[PDB]
């Protein structure tokens, strides 16, 4: 449900 | 400022599907929604503009549609390079605000993944530290097991994994477990195994080295 | 074309302030607006402000008083500026223009700039070599260990190599440094014809390093 700095993605 | 709600949170399809992302509205905007794309890595790419208006480059796959609160972005065949996160943005009240997102996972067959071990290098060992690394390549679905021994002890807390996200070619995940010691305690031991779990695999896979041959 | 180019990712003090140029190509700077969007893992997508063709200024209610946003149309750059940063002003920025000059669809993007907010010092990575040791694949990578901040980047033989390429994403050390390793498989036949060299490059520390992987 967040976005990750580290894939541009989200997760969780 | 306008609420955007995107639904679902995760979407998940198999390639030749189709497949509708929803974006809800905390009141009407008219017509004045964008759609963007975001690969791994990557900046956003613009999709849709005004719930329906076509993109130069972007493929007809794409569409968009609604009025008002509900509006809903279409991919009516869906394949692989698809692999992204898909937001919604609206622009007829200021600030322009944008949705959470959905996440778009492909489906596919079982892939059983190929397990490499990497024993520490001597130019790291200098250091006073090693790292074995345990590689699980090219394998569905995402959920792996790695189980690391160092002469049959149970290695536990002192091993991390970082997983890829899906492969936009083959929709496939890549894995690599790092098992740390010191190199203390790497020099006194001498068998180093990882063990794999998938569901591709009928029974567990182990790959191992002696330290030095 | 048309592009839009930042500098460099970097590491901020708490309480410092925040500095990124965008170069553009392919247009004026006094024909469109130029608009600033981060994205954040607490906030998502959110967009920061806009300089218009005019010069004039544009920032979103939140940021009114530590934003600021100024320009060269000579030179081509937009210049972004916020103060104060905390924790939580750790994202990536982008600048980013529209269709038209007027309006706010988002056709063209910079590459983005991740920005850590941290008191930490920088320090660049390590890299040691996976060597390569079934069925005619076999697998080579580099282990990239012990730097901060964020990101680093990894290409194979200066971008000639690409296919088979996994980069895993970077994960937090208990040290408060990063990690990561990036493989590719080759043929094993290749192992004694080809070169096999992972380029490193950390930013933030300027250091640029090129590991040649062999067997051992």
Redesign the interface.
Known sequence: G???????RLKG | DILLTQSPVILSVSPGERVSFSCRASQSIGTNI?W?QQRTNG????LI??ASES?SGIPSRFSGSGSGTDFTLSINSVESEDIADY?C?Q?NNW???????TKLELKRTVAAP?V?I????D??LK?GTA?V?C?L?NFYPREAKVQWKVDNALQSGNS?????EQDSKDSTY?L?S?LTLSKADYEKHKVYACEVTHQGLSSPVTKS?NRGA | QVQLKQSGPGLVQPSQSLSITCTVSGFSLTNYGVHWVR????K????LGVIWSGGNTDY??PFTSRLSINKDNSKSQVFFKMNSLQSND???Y?CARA?TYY?????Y????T?VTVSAASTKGP?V????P??GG?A?L?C?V?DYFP??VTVSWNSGALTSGV??????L?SSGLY???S?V?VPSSSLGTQTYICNVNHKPSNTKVDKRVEPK
Do not use: C, M
């Not at chain 3, 040691?128 to 060597?131: D, E, K, R, V």
């Open positions: 967040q976005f990750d700095l580290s894939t541009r | 964008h963007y900046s956003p790419r613009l503009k005004y993109i937001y943005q622009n600030p322009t605000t944008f949705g959470a997102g190929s490499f990497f024993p520490p290098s130019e790291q250091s790292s690394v590689l390549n991390q994994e970082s997983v890829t890549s690599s790092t080295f | 994205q954040s893992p607490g998502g997508l959110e967009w979103n209610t750790t994202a990536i982008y269709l309006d706010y669809e988002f056709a993007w910079g590459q983005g991740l390590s040691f070599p996976l060597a040791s079934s694949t697998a990578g282990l260990k964020e990101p996994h980069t895993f994403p970077a994960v050390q990690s990561l390793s493989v498989t």
